[PDB]
Every structure is written in C-alpha cells, then in structure tokens.
Scaffold this motif. Structure first.
Motif, PDB file in Angstrom:
ATOM      1  N   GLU A  82      90.454  28.053 -21.797  1.00 42.01           N
ATOM      2  CA  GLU A  82      89.958  26.698 -22.001  1.00 42.01           C
ATOM      3  C   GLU A  82      90.206  26.235 -23.458  1.00 42.01           C
ATOM      4  O   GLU A  82      90.681  25.147 -23.669  1.00 42.01           O
ATOM      5  N   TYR A  83      89.863  27.036 -24.463  1.00 43.09           N
ATOM      6  CA  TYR A  83      90.102  26.677 -25.905  1.00 43.09           C
ATOM      7  C   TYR A  83      90.075  27.934 -26.781  1.00 43.09           C
ATOM      8  O   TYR A  83      89.524  28.948 -26.375  1.00 43.09           O
ATOM      9  N   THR A  84      90.692  27.875 -27.957  1.00 45.69           N
ATOM     10  CA  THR A  84      90.575  28.955 -28.925  1.00 45.69           C
ATOM     11  C   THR A  84      89.946  28.457 -30.252  1.00 45.69           C
ATOM     12  O   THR A  84      89.968  27.283 -30.564  1.00 45.69           O
ATOM     13  N   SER A 105      98.095  35.013 -31.957  1.00 47.31           N
ATOM     14  CA  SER A 105      99.209  34.194 -31.506  1.00 47.31           C
ATOM     15  C   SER A 105      99.544  34.482 -30.064  1.00 47.31           C
ATOM     16  O   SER A 105     100.189  33.646 -29.433  1.00 47.31           O
ATOM     17  N   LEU A 106      99.170  35.638 -29.518  1.00 48.02           N
ATOM     18  CA  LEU A 106      99.452  35.864 -28.072  1.00 48.02           C
ATOM     19  C   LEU A 106      98.547  34.971 -27.278  1.00 48.02           C
ATOM     20  O   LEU A 106      98.998  34.244 -26.421  1.00 48.02           O
ATOM     21  N   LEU A 145      97.111  32.202 -28.215  1.00 55.97           N
ATOM     22  CA  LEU A 145      97.462  30.789 -28.372  1.00 55.97           C
ATOM     23  C   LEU A 145      98.651  30.460 -27.489  1.00 55.97           C
ATOM     24  O   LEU A 145      98.761  29.357 -26.971  1.00 55.97           O
ATOM     25  N   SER A 146      99.551  31.411 -27.310  1.00 59.67           N
ATOM     26  CA  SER A 146     100.709  31.178 -26.461  1.00 59.67           C
ATOM     27  C   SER A 146     100.299  31.084 -25.047  1.00 59.67           C
ATOM     28  O   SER A 146     100.835  30.290 -24.309  1.00 59.67           O
ATOM     29  N   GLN A 172      97.439  30.054 -24.078  1.00 62.17           N
ATOM     30  CA  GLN A 172      96.682  28.815 -23.952  1.00 62.17           C
ATOM     31  C   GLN A 172      97.645  27.688 -23.787  1.00 62.17           C
ATOM     32  O   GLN A 172      97.461  26.843 -22.906  1.00 62.17           O
ATOM     33  N   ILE A 173      98.681  27.708 -24.631  1.00 62.50           N
ATOM     34  CA  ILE A 173      99.686  26.626 -24.636  1.00 62.50           C
ATOM     35  C   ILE A 173     100.459  26.565 -23.350  1.00 62.50           C
ATOM     36  O   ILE A 173     100.673  25.481 -22.905  1.00 62.50           O
ATOM     37  N   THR A 174     100.856  27.723 -22.787  1.00 63.76           N
ATOM     38  CA  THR A 174     101.704  27.767 -21.588  1.00 63.76           C
ATOM     39  C   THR A 174     100.914  27.771 -20.278  1.00 63.76           C
ATOM     40  O   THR A 174     101.476  27.725 -19.221  1.00 63.76           O
ATOM     41  N   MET A 226      99.018  30.236 -19.070  1.00 58.94           N
ATOM     42  CA  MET A 226      98.838  31.555 -18.477  1.00 58.94           C
ATOM     43  C   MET A 226      97.378  31.755 -18.106  1.00 58.94           C
ATOM     44  O   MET A 226      96.454  31.201 -18.813  1.00 58.94           O
ATOM     45  N   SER A 249     101.199  29.435 -38.642  1.00 62.48           N
ATOM     46  CA  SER A 249     101.999  29.229 -37.423  1.00 62.48           C
ATOM     47  C   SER A 249     101.143  28.701 -36.233  1.00 62.48           C
ATOM     48  O   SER A 249     101.664  28.144 -35.221  1.00 62.48           O
ATOM     49  N   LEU A 250      99.845  28.910 -36.306  1.00 59.52           N
ATOM     50  CA  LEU A 250      99.021  28.337 -35.222  1.00 59.52           C
ATOM     51  C   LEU A 250      98.992  26.794 -35.369  1.00 59.52           C
ATOM     52  O   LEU A 250      99.280  25.988 -34.416  1.00 59.52           O
ATOM     53  N   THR A 276     103.265  21.048 -30.235  1.00 59.43           N
ATOM     54  CA  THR A 276     102.929  20.846 -28.829  1.00 59.43           C
ATOM     55  C   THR A 276     101.978  19.681 -28.600  1.00 59.43           C
ATOM     56  O   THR A 276     101.623  19.373 -27.479  1.00 59.43           O
ATOM     57  N   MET A 313      98.787  19.464 -29.431  1.00 62.33           N
ATOM     58  CA  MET A 313      97.401  19.841 -29.293  1.00 62.33           C
ATOM     59  C   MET A 313      96.540  18.983 -30.185  1.00 62.33           C
ATOM     60  O   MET A 313      96.975  18.510 -31.245  1.00 62.33           O
ATOM     61  N   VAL A 333      89.134  26.242 -37.298  1.00 63.86           N
ATOM     62  CA  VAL A 333      89.871  25.293 -36.485  1.00 63.86           C
ATOM     63  C   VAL A 333      89.679  25.576 -35.009  1.00 63.86           C
ATOM     64  O   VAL A 333      89.695  26.715 -34.594  1.00 63.86           O
ATOM     65  N   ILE A 334      89.565  24.532 -34.205  1.00 63.85           N
ATOM     66  CA  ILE A 334      89.414  24.669 -32.764  1.00 63.85           C
ATOM     67  C   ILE A 334      90.651  24.058 -32.138  1.00 63.85           C
ATOM     68  O   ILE A 334      91.016  22.949 -32.488  1.00 63.85           O
ATOM     69  N   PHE A 335      91.306  24.790 -31.244  1.00 63.95           N
ATOM     70  CA  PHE A 335      92.510  24.350 -30.576  1.00 63.95           C
ATOM     71  C   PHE A 335      92.155  23.972 -29.130  1.00 63.95           C
ATOM     72  O   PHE A 335      91.693  24.833 -28.337  1.00 63.95           O
ATOM     73  N   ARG A 336      92.361  22.700 -28.766  1.00 65.84           N
ATOM     74  CA  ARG A 336      91.999  22.207 -27.432  1.00 65.84           C
ATOM     75  C   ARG A 336      93.245  21.759 -26.683  1.00 65.84           C
ATOM     76  O   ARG A 336      94.082  21.030 -27.277  1.00 65.84           O
ATOM     77  N   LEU A 347     106.021  39.475 -24.661  1.00 67.33           N
ATOM     78  CA  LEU A 347     105.255  38.347 -24.165  1.00 67.33           C
ATOM     79  C   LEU A 347     106.141  37.127 -24.015  1.00 67.33           C
ATOM     80  O   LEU A 347     105.930  36.332 -23.104  1.00 67.33           O
ATOM     81  N   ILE A 407     106.878  35.107 -20.608  1.00 63.81           N
ATOM     82  CA  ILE A 407     106.651  33.694 -20.498  1.00 63.81           C
ATOM     83  C   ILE A 407     107.896  32.986 -20.031  1.00 63.81           C
ATOM     84  O   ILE A 407     107.811  32.147 -19.123  1.00 63.81           O
TER      85      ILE A 407
END
Ligand SMILES: CCOC(=O)NCCCNC(=O)OCCO[C@H]1[C@H](O[C@H]2[C@H](O)[C@@H](O)[C@H](O)O[C@@H]2CO)O[C@H](CO)[C@H](O[C@H]2O[C@H](CO)[C@H](O)[C@H](O)[C@H]2O)[C@@H]1O
Ligand SMILES: *O[C@H]1[C@H](O[C@H]2[C@H](O)[C@@H](O)[C@H](O)O[C@@H]2CO)O[C@H](CO)[C@H](O[C@H]2O[C@H](CO)[C@H](O)[C@H](O)[C@H]2O)[C@@H]1O
Ligand SMILES: *O[C@H]1[C@H](O[C@H]2[C@H](O)[C@@H](O)[C@H](O)O[C@@H]2CO)O[C@H](CO)[C@H](O[C@H]2O[C@H](CO)[C@H](O)[C@H](O)[C@H]2O)[C@@H]1O
Ligand SMILES: OC[C@H]1O[C@H](O[C@@H]2[C@H](O)[C@@H](O)[C@H](O[C@H]3[C@H](O)[C@@H](O)[C@H](O)O[C@@H]3CO)O[C@@H]2CO)[C@H](O)[C@@H](O)[C@H]1O
Ligand SMILES: OC[C@H]1O[C@H](O[C@@H]2[C@H](O)[C@@H](O)[C@H](O[C@H]3[C@H](O)[C@@H](O)[C@H](O)O[C@@H]3CO)O[C@@H]2CO)[C@H](O)[C@@H](O)[C@H]1O
Ligand SMILES: OC[C@H]1O[C@H](O[C@@H]2[C@H](O)[C@@H](O)[C@H](O[C@H]3[C@H](O)[C@@H](O)[C@H](O)O[C@@H]3CO)O[C@@H]2CO)[C@H](O)[C@@H](O)[C@H]1O
Ligand SMILES: OC[C@H]1O[C@H](O)[C@H](O)[C@@H](O)[C@H]1O
Lengths: 69, 69, 69, 69, 69
Positions: free
Chosen positions: A10-12, A38-39, A41-42, A44-46, A48, B38-39, B46, B48, B66-69, E41, E45
C-alpha cells in the motif's frame, strides 16, 4: 518464520533512523535491512504481491524476510 | 514529526556536498541521507506522490522522513 | 555555482578510473561522485532534462552539481 | 583505449568471483568493476547500444570502459 | 560449473541472514552474493529467462553463477 501478511505494498516510509516501514495487508511493519529499501520500493512501484514473514506480527513490528511474487 | 508538504516531486538536485535537494509543494528541502537519493529519483520518474515530514518546514530546510504513495 | 549546460543526456561513459562522463548540450564533462552514476544513467534512459552546474565549463571539465527536471 | 565492440548486450553473466561478463558483438568480455554491474544490466534490459573500449579485445578479455548510447 | 536450471524467476525471497533465495525451474536455491539481489529482482520483474549454474543442484542449494538472457 510464520507468514504474517500478503498483499501489494500500500505505501512505504523512510524513517528518521534509516529504517524502512511498509504497509501490506492490515499491518505496518519495519525493517532495519538497508538492502530491502529499494527492493520493496520496486515492488511497490510495479504492483508486485509480497508476503512478509515475521513473528512480530503486529503494527510497529519488525521484519527481515519478504517474498516477491 | 509534523507533515510539511505533500505532492509529486517537481525536481531534484544533487548538491556539491553529496546532499540531495527535492522540490515538493512550495518547499525546496534537502536530505543528507544517501539512501533516499535513488528512492526520491524513482518517485520523481514514476510520478509518485510523496509526503515529506520535517520540523524544519521552510525553503532550505532539512528532512529525513518521506512517505511514498 | 553557475549553470553550464542544459539538455537531455546524449550519451554517458564509464571511465577507466571509475569516473563517469556525460554529454549534455555541447559539453563532455565528468564526475568522480559514484552516487551520480546510476542517477545520470536513469535520466539518460528516461529522457529527463538535466542541468549541470560547474565553474569548469569546458570539454573534459569536472562537475558534481546536477538538476533533474 | 581502442574501440573493441559495439552492439546491444546479448546476455550478461554474474561470475563466481563477483566479476561480470557481457556479450556484445562477437565478444564475451568481463569487468571487475562492481559499479558497472547494474548499469550493464539496465542497458541490457532497455535495449541500449553500448560500445566497449579495451586493449584486451578477445573472448575472456577484461574491460572497464563502456559507452552508453 | 554445470547448468542446473533454466527458466523465468517464479519468485524471490529475502532471508533473515541477508541471503537471497530464488525459484527457477523446479529448484529453490540461494546466494550469499549481495550484488545479485537487485539483478535477480530485475530479471523477475522484467520476465527475463535466467540460467543458474551450480554443483549443489537440489532444493536449498547454493549458487553464485547466473546467466541473464
Ligand atoms: C533557512 C536558510 O538556511 C538553511 O536553510 N540552512 C539549512 C542548513 C542547516 N541545516 C540544519 O541545521 O539541519 C539541522 C537542524 O535541522 C534539522 C531539524 O533540527 C531541529 C531539531 O531537531 C529541533 O529539535 C530543534 O528545535 O530545531 C531544529 C530545526 O527546526 O530537524 C529536522 C527534522 O525534524 C531536520 O533534520 C533531518 O534532516 C537532516 C538532513 O537530512 C538530518 O538528517 C537530520 O538527522 C534529520 O532529522 C533538519 O535538518
Ligand atoms: O583467475 C583469476 C580470476 O578470474 C576469473 C574471471 O574474473 C572471470 O571472468 C571468470 O569467469 O572466472 C575467472 C576464473 O577464475 O579472478 C580472480 C580475482 O577476481 C583471481 O584474479 C587475480 O589473480 C591474478 C594473480 O595475480 C591476477 O592479478 C588477476 O588478474 C587478479 O585479479 C584469479 O586468479
Ligand atoms: O557448496 C557449494 C558448492 O561447492 C562445491 C565445490 O564447488 C566443488 O568443487 C565440490 O566438489 O563440490 C562442492 C559441493 O557442491 O559450490 C556451488 C557452486 O559450484 C555452491 O557454491 C556457491 O554458492 C555459495 C553460496 O551461494 C557461495 O556463493 C560459494 O562461494 C559459491 O561457490 C555451493 O554452495
Ligand atoms: O549565512 C547563511 C544564512 O544565514 C542567514 O539566514 C539564516 C538562516 O540560514 C536561514 O535559514 C533563516 O531563514 C529563516 C527565514 O528567513 C524565516 O523567515 C523563516 O521563517 O524561517 C527560516 C529559518 O528559521 O534565517 C536566518 C537569519 O534570520 C542569512 O540571513 C541568510 O542569507 C544566509 O546567509
Ligand atoms: O575490468 C577488468 C580489467 O579491465 C581493464 O583491463 C584490460 C585488461 O584486463 C588488461 O589485461 C589490459 O592490459 C593491457 C595494458 O593496459 C597494456 O599496457 C598492455 O600492453 O596490454 C594489456 C593486454 O592487452 O588492459 C585492458 C584495457 O586497456 C582495466 O583497466 C583493469 O584495471 C581491470 O578492471
Ligand atoms: O566499480 C566500483 C569499485 O568496485 C570494485 O571493488 C569492490 C567494492 O566496490 C569495494 O568497496 C571493495 O573493497 C574491499 C577491498 O577490496 C578490501 O581491501 C576491504 O577489506 O574490503 C573492502 C570493502 O569491501 O571490493 C570490491 C572488489 O573486491 C573495484 O575493484 C573497485 O576498484 C571499483 O572499481
Ligand atoms: O558518492 C560517493 C563517493 O565516491 C568516491 C568519490 O571519490 C567520493 O568523493 C564520493 O562521491
């Protein structure tokens, strides 16, 4: 280690002590492993689906095991 | 920590002292945490929506949460 | 620091001394900051527009300040 | 250093001594620079055309210079 | 080293001792190389086909050699 939650990420949140919080299912959990930042976040982004394994299966609880599907 | 700004990442800048500046909402802020570099760029790339938490909520002010949504 | 060039990253080059060269605008410049390597590649791959800031604004000149737009 | 091969990255290989091998043109080459590992895998994944520069321009030969186009 | 399995990466798992497990073909294997974590990873992906080379070619066995196609 027992399964705790399974779902999309849902979020990081990057925290003030360099840990990394994640919300999966109905649980907010954190990990002190910098490798996972970063795994996760990836994932989350994709979009998975991940499974988190932890005995501290409560909000605020710690984890280090994650399965990427 | 209090919420400071929420938005997409307008731009980032790598600074000469290896800090990383980010523009979110109407605030330019920096972080000395290398892990966020890099985050933050992935978030920017992307599209976000992030929320930055800091008590130094002014242009030039520092952050680590930081919160990534 | 003054602006030097603004553009998309035409090409990058990993160099034998572990520095990283970038062509932006009409200038080839390099940076000894390892942190910038994957950020600059990402900008190249995604077509981001960068601005490089450096007082050594000539071919072969060094930089450490980049803006990602 | 002389140009050696130009082309897309046909495949990469992670090796038992943590070096990284790459197939470009008709040559298989390796690099002991860890920094290039994820750059070369990103170039492979996105279909970038690279040029490798090296005086050891034979199968098995070593390199540290790459141009990403 | 002999080929062991070839296929897409069915799933990965970050382990409690900072190793990384991977399911390819009919084998679950792990590597203690941190470098391989984000490479594997990425392969997962992007749906790359990998080959793992290991003499410990059973479930729970170790590897360090991967080929990314
Ligand atoms: C206005 C023009 O001048 C500047 O903008 N100058 C910027 C540079 C100087 N930066 C600086 O001093 O940062 C440290 C002080 O700022 C951090 C801030 O400190 C609080 C302190 O914790 C409070 O208790 C006290 O009352 O005041 C100060 C400021 O209001 O705390 C925030 C988060 O709450 C930031 O710290 C966070 O970011 C930095 C950089 O990434 C650092 O890691 C800290 O560890 C992290 O918490 C401010 O930088
Ligand atoms: O034989 C070397 C070893 O070579 C590796 C190579 O890196 C990969 O391309 C290949 O797939 O696997 C081969 C076979 O091992 O590299 C290691 C260190 O990474 C050792 O290398 C050193 O040994 C030499 C003795 O001085 C010489 O200096 C090498 O160039 C060193 O790097 C091993 O001996
Ligand atoms: O146990 C190792 C395996 O050991 C081999 C050794 O290579 C042989 O010469 C011997 O006869 O047979 C043993 C048992 O299989 O090496 C394999 C790959 O050949 C694995 O080793 C790798 O994996 C480890 C954890 O990933 C670590 O990375 C090693 O350095 C790698 O070589 C297996 O674990
Ligand atoms: O020499 C460095 C710097 O010093 C002076 O600015 C000081 C701080 O560096 C600066 O962050 C601070 O900014 C203020 C705003 O002006 C204020 O209106 C707003 O509410 O918050 C911040 C921080 O509390 O101001 C101080 C001085 O008051 C100097 O003024 C500045 O030019 C620069 O040189
Ligand atoms: O990445 C591994 C390796 O790559 C680079 O070295 C290359 C070869 O590994 C190396 O054997 C080769 O040596 C050259 C000398 O520069 C030259 O003076 C001599 O006369 O010829 C030999 C063999 O042809 O050089 C190449 C590229 O020039 C990298 O520089 C090195 O540190 C290492 O990473
Ligand atoms: O391409 C970047 C970089 O990669 C290679 O070095 C690796 C790591 O990046 C580096 O931090 C590491 O150094 C070791 C020393 O070799 C050792 O003396 C010490 O005790 O432990 C440190 C920290 O691990 O080593 C690896 C390679 O073995 C590459 O060779 C390096 O020059 C540079 O290009
Ligand atoms: O960024 C990481 C670090 O890498 C190396 C350079 O010599 C440094 O000055 C610094 O960049």
């Amino acid at each position: 280690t027992p399964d705790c939650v399974t779902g999309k990420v849902e979020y990081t949140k990057y925290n003030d002590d360099d840990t990394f919080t994640v919300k999966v299912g109905d649980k907010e959990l954190f990990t002190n492993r910098w490798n996972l930042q970063s795994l996760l976040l990836s994932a989350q982004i994709t979009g998975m689906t991940v499974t988190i394994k932890t005995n501290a299966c409560h909000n605020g609880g710690g984890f280090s095991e994650v399965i990427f599907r």
